From Swiss-Prot:
Changing I165V: In P9; increases fluorescence at 475 nm excitation. In R10-3; matures to the red-emitting state with excitation and emission maxima at 555 and 585 nm, respectively. Changing F65L: In EGFP; increases fluorescence at warmer temperatures such as 37 degrees Celsius. In EBFP; gives rise to variants with blue fluorescence. Changing M151T: Increases fluorescence at warmer temperatures such as 37 degrees Celsius. Monomer. Changing V222R: In Azurite; shifts the excitation and emission spectra to shorter wavelengths and increases quantum yields compared to BFP. Contains a chromophore consisting of modified amino acid residues. Maturation of the chromophore requires nothing other than molecular oxygen. This is Green fluorescent protein. Changing F97S: In alphaGFP/cycle 3 GFP; improves folding at 37 degrees Celsius, reduces aggregation at high concentrations, and increases the diffusibility of the protein inside cells. It comes from Aequorea victoria (Water jellyfish). Changing Y143F: In Sapphire/H9-40; exhibits a huge Stoke's shift, with an excitation peak at 399 nm and an emission peak at 511 nm. In Azurite; shifts the excitation and emission spectra to shorter wavelengths and increases quantum yields compared to BFP. Belongs to the GFP family. Green fluorescent protein has been engineered to produce a vast number of variously colored mutants, fusion proteins, and biosensors. Further generation of mutants led to more stable proteins (at 37 degrees Celsius for example) with brighter fluorescence and longer fluorescence lifetimes. Changing N196I: In mut2.1; shifts fluorescence lifetime from 3.03 to 2.50 ns. Changing N144I: In ECFP; leads to cyan fluorescence, folds faster and more efficiently at 37 degrees Celsius and has superior solubility and brightness.
């Protein structure tokens, strides 16, 4: 049978993202809009910095900016924690350690508001070098493909997730961003606790040629794998 959580994702779903951030005291807010098509694991989003210039590189926010849109193969449906938590939603927490630099801590609540899937986020960054790759804006506007590793966290009725992002620096080098993540349901109902598996991501960043505000257009594809 198709679960209630699954049923909410069979078509194209509008997405709204709202983020308030503060990195080394540089405060900023971002709004995003677009749509997700989980059947194809496809996300299309545009983000706008509503407070002016973004004080960090857009690529460092890609992972923060709705894993319920991953394409889970039919044979892995019992391992899709994200959709099983819907519509009441889940809380996603991360610490992101930028190697030889600062860290972001994020807390996001992801849930439906009517037909819209909403991701509301607070991000706090500390201990950045004011002339490092982040605050010094030395990261290229591009993005590599990565795997994201998921395991059950039964004692917390959720999942633990880990992965490494490599951001290309403008000199040809790499800025590593080590991600540690936990998700927990917002409601008190049952969820699916997965066997170990991963999501495969590929992301493309672009600009809207007609947009004068600081912004990022994101096209992302996400597919679950690792269990056959």
């Amino acid at each position: 049978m198709v679960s209630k959580g699954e049923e909410l994702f069979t078509g194209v779903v509008p997405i709204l993202v709202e983020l308030d951030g503060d990195v080394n005291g540089h405060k900023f807010s971002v709004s995003g809009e677009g749509e997700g098509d989980a059947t194809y694991g496809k996300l299309t989003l545009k983000f706008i910095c509503t407070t002016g210039k973004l004080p960090v590189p857009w690529p460092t926010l890609v992972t923060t900016f709705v894993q319920c849109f991953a394409r889970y193969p039919d044979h892995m449906r019992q391992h899709d924690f994200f959709k099983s938590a819907m519509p009441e939603g889940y809380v996603q927490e991360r610490t992101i350690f930028f190697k030889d630099d600062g860290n972001y801590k994020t807390r996001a609540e992801v849930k439906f508001e009517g037909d819209t899937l909403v991701n509301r986020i607070e991000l706090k960054g500390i201990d950045f070098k004011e002339d490092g790759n982040i605050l010094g804006h030395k990261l290229e506007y591009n993005y590599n493909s990565h795997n994201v590793y998921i395991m059950a966290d039964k004692q917390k009725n959720g999942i633990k997730v880990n992965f490494k992002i490599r951001h290309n620096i403008e000199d040809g080098s790499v800025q590593l961003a080590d991600h540690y993540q936990q998700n927990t349901p917002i409601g008190d109902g049952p969820v699916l606790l997965p066997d170990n598996h991963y999501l495969s991501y590929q992301s493309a960043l672009s600009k809207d040629p007609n947009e004068k505000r600081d912004h990022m257009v994101l096209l992302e594809f996400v597919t679950a794998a690792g269990i056959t």
